[PDB]
Every structure is written in structure tokens, then in C-alpha cells.
Ligand binder design. Structure first.
Ligand SMILES: *[C@@H]1O[C@H](CO)[C@@H](O[C@@H]2O[C@H](CO)[C@@H](O)[C@H](O)[C@H]2NC(C)=O)[C@H](O)[C@H]1NC(C)=O
Ligand SMILES: *[C@@H]1O[C@H](CO)[C@@H](O[C@@H]2O[C@H](CO)[C@@H](O)[C@H](O)[C@H]2NC(C)=O)[C@H](O)[C@H]1NC(C)=O
Ligand SMILES: C[C@H](C(=O)O)c1ccc(-c2ccccc2)c(F)c1
Ligand SMILES: *[C@@H]1O[C@H](CO)[C@@H](O)[C@H](O)[C@H]1NC(C)=O
Ligand SMILES: [Fe+3]
Ligand SMILES: [Zn+2]
Ligand SMILES: [Zn+2]
Lengths: 335, 6
């Protein structure tokens, strides 16, 4: 067998990967890049084997030949006798969240407001809301829709990065990795919690996981669910308990990708690594927990229960689903 | 619609 070389995006993920690599006796080792696209390039060159990706990045990786290997599976809404690794994945709900105190903000009054996005090219933070907005406005000018935004990955001098804050020192503003204070699901929800933006494009779980004491982090520790609303597409506002009926889309779960020729080896190594370090793993919490990172969703989402086998050896188009692939392709016609 | 971005 061979070692599997994981790709970590940014220095926080690198730190976690190095701990995993130490704990796994170098069965896993780490390459690191500054952005998820750069990690996808390391994997295409064969200088890393694999990483776990949002669906929008699975699209970029899959057009370049990489394939899905195992998917994140979080706690499921319905009981099941099935082992987590054999349970079919239930996507997540992309939502638009605002503060309840920002009265009269709805889907239909988003123009000229301030927005918080996980990063350009991600499912809930960008592809689903910007795809809907281009469609509804009949215009590709999505870069002038919101007055200002934090959309990590966009041009840092542009209005799409004006709300981004970078790192402690204020460097790396708008970079699409965990150093940008408003990156990712928890960064974009923080951008709304702090009232830097009027709306955040995240998923349902983000709201729940960072409110009502679910997070002990300083910016989150006082947030109350009842102070947030979701924006529904018919122009109504609902409590965040109502995401099943007030979402923008259902997104395919994040998943691990690799080159075809290393997919079977990556899959075998990962099933053994989660047996050691996953939820109820032999060495978690004592030694190392692969699906924890103090809410920061480093390498994998912290709500992951396991990585699960995929049905039907799917292509990346089959894993994303034709509807979503066609929505992304439409959106990318713009730029 | 078509090729790899890289
Ligand atoms: C929205 O997200 C939350 C957080 O993941 C979901 O609440 C969890 O649901 C599972 C069961 O599906 C519970 O057993 C967990 O305890 C819940 N977590 C928290 C923090 O309360 C909620 O079900 C999701 N809503 C929708 C419509 O999917
Ligand atoms: C944006 O609008 C386009 C045009 O309708 C959507 O593309 C269609 O999606 C449906 C449902 O999957 C297909 O039956 C059509 O073939 C697609 N049309 C075209 C011209 O490609 C797209 O789904 C919309 N985007 C979002 C995010 O909803
Ligand atoms: C395979 C993937 C996943 O969650 O792992 C996935 C998830 C959800 C869908 C899906 C598409 C439209 C409506 C509801 C679900 C889909 F086509 C693919
Ligand atoms: C390293 O992997 C090999 C082959 O699967 C195995 O014999 C060994 O137990 C693994 N150890 C860890 C700590 O991941
Ligand atoms: Fe996502
Ligand atoms: Zn729906
Ligand atoms: Zn198939």
C-alpha cells in the first residue's frame, strides 16, 4: 500500500492535517495550498491524492477528471438501522439568513444590501443564490447587485470583497481559506451576526450550530436563534425552525475527490482512518478526532458523523445531480 | 460548459 497525501487549504487546515498525519503513523501525509482550486491542481498533477470538497468545487474538480470517492454524512433526520457508512446521504438545505431586527428585508428587497457568502464558487454561499439572482434579474451583472459583500475568492479591490476582514493582522483579505475572518459557513454567519452584512448565504445547520450556546466562541456564544429569520423565495420570512419549507435549494453533501486511479486506495485508507479517528472511533476523543476542529470545519465539516460509501459508482455529474450541474453551467456563462 | 479550468 501507499500513503495517502491529503491536501489542506490554508495554514489552519495544514495544522490539523499534520496532527492527523502524526496520529496515523504517516499513513496519511499533507500537502498544503492557499486555496481549494490550488489543491485541485496539486491533485491533478499527482502531488496530492485527495481532499474533501463543497459541491461547487466538485464541479470544478470533476470537469478536470477527478471523481467523488466518499461523501460526508451528518446525523440523519430519520432513524435508520443502517450503519452511517452505508446510509444514503440527504443533502443539506441552502438558506438565506437575516436578522429578525432588520424588518422588511425579504428576498425581493435584496438589491443594494450587504451580503456575506461562504466563498465564490461554493454551493450555498454562491452558486445557488447568485444563480437565482442572475435568473430573476435577467442580468449577468451579479457583481453589482449587492452594494458591498464578503465573497472570498473575488477580486480584493472589488465591492464583492469590501466587507471581508482578513486575518488578525488584517492581511489576506478575501482569500478563500479559514485565515479570512468571514470565510466559509461559520465566517459568513459571523459576518451577519456582527451586522457587517444584511444577509448570509449559508446552510441550515450553520444557524443552529452557532446559536443558543451550541458554540462557545466569543462572537457566537450570545447569539439566539430567535433573533434570525430565513428568507423564502416567495418573499416571506420565517423562523429558522422552518428551513424545510423556506430554503433556496437542497445541496449535494460535501465529498472527497481524487484521481480515478487513486480512488480505490483513497477510499480504503479513509474507511480505516475514520474507524480510528471518526465519531466513536477507537482513538477519538483520546488521541485525535478527524471531524472536530472547534467549529471551524477544517478538512471536514464538524457535523460529519462519517464518510459514507457512494451508490452506483457515480460520476461527478451523477453525484451533483443534473439540475445542479445545469444551474452551475448557466451561472458560469456570466463570467 | 466544456473543458477543465486549468
Ligand atoms: C437544521 O439544522 C439543525 C442542525 O443540524 C437540525 O437540528 C439537528 O437535527 C438532528 C436530527 O436531525 C438532531 O437530532 C440534532 O440535535 C439537531 N441539532 C441541533 C443543534 O438542534 C435541524 O433538524 C435542521 N432542520 C432541517 C429542516 O433540516
Ligand atoms: C437559471 O435558469 C436556467 C434557465 O431556466 C435554469 O436552467 C434550466 O434548469 C431546468 C431544471 O433543471 C432544466 O429543465 C433546463 O434545461 C435548464 N435550462 C437551460 C437553458 O439550461 C437553471 O436551473 C436556473 N438556475 C437556478 C440556480 O435555479
Ligand atoms: C448525491 C448528493 C449527496 O447529498 O450526497 C445529492 C443530494 C441531493 C440531490 C437532490 C437534488 C434535488 C432535490 C433533492 C436532492 C442530488 F441529486 C444529489
Ligand atoms: C497504517 O496502515 C497500515 C496498512 O493499512 C496498517 O497496518 C497500520 O495499522 C496503519 N496505522 C494507522 C495508525 O493508521
Ligand atoms: Fe457547501
Ligand atoms: Zn425544496
Ligand atoms: Zn452512473
Amino acid at each position: 500500500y501507499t500513503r495517502v497525501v491529503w491536501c489542506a487549504v490554508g495554514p489552519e487546515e495544514q495544522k490539523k492535517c499534520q496532527q492527523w498525519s502524526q496520529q496515523s503513523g504517516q499513513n496519511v501525509t499533507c500537502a498544503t495550498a492557499s486555496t481549494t482550486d490550488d489543491c485541485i491542481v496539486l491533485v491533478l498533477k499527482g502531488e496530492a491524492d485527495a481532499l474533501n470538497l463543497d459541491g461547487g468545487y466538485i464541479y470544478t474538480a470533476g470537469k478536470c477528471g477527478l471523481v467523488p470517492v466518499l461523501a460526508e454524512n451528518r446525523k440523519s433526520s430519520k432513524h435508520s438501522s443502517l450503519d452511517c457508512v452505508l446510509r444514503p446521504t440527504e443533502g443539506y438545505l441552502a438558506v438565506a439568513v437575516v436578522k429578525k431586527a432588520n424588518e422588511g428585508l425579504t428576498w425581493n428587497s435584496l438589491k443594494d444590501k450587504k451580503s456575506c457568502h461562504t466563498a465564490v464558487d461554493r454551493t450555498a454561499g454562491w452558486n445557488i443564490p447568485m444563480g437565482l439572482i442572475v435568473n430573476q434579474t435577467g442580468s449577468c451583472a451579479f457583481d453589482e447587485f449587492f452594494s458591498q459583500s464578503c465573497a472570498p475568492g473575488a477580486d480584493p479591490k472589488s465591492r464583492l470583497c469590501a466587507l471581508c476582514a482578513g486575518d488578525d493582522q488584517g492581511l489576506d483579505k478575501c482569500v478563500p481559506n479559514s485565515k479570512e475572518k468571514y470565510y466559509g459557513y461559520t465566517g459568513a454567519f459571523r459576518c451577519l451576526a456582527e451586522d457587517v452584512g444584511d444577509v448570509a448565504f449559508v446552510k441550515n445547520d450553520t444557524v443552529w450550530e452557532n446559536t443558543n450556546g451550541e458554540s462557545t466562541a466569543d462572537w457566537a456564544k450570545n447569539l439566539k436563534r430567535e433573533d434570525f429569520r430565513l428568507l423564502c423565495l416567495d418573499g416571506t420570512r420565517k423562523p429558522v425552525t422552518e428551513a424545510q419549507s423556506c430554503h433556496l435549494a437542497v445541496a449535494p453533501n460535501h465529498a472527497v475527490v481524487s484521481r480515478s486511479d487513486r480512488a480505490a486506495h483513497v477510499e480504503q485508507v479513509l474507511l480505516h482512518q475514520q474507524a480510528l479517528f471518526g465519531k466513536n472511533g477507537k482513538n477519538c476523543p483520546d488521541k485525535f478526532c478527524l471531524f472536530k476542529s472547534e467549529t471551524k470545519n477544517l478538512l471536514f465539516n464538524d457535523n460529519t458523523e462519517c464518510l459514507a460509501k457512494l451508490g452506483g459508482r457515480p460520476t461527478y455529474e451523477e453525484y451533483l445531480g443534473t439540475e445542479y450541474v445545469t444551474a452551475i453551467a448557466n451561472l458560469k456563462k456570466c463570467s | 460548459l466544456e473543458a477543465c479550468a486549468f
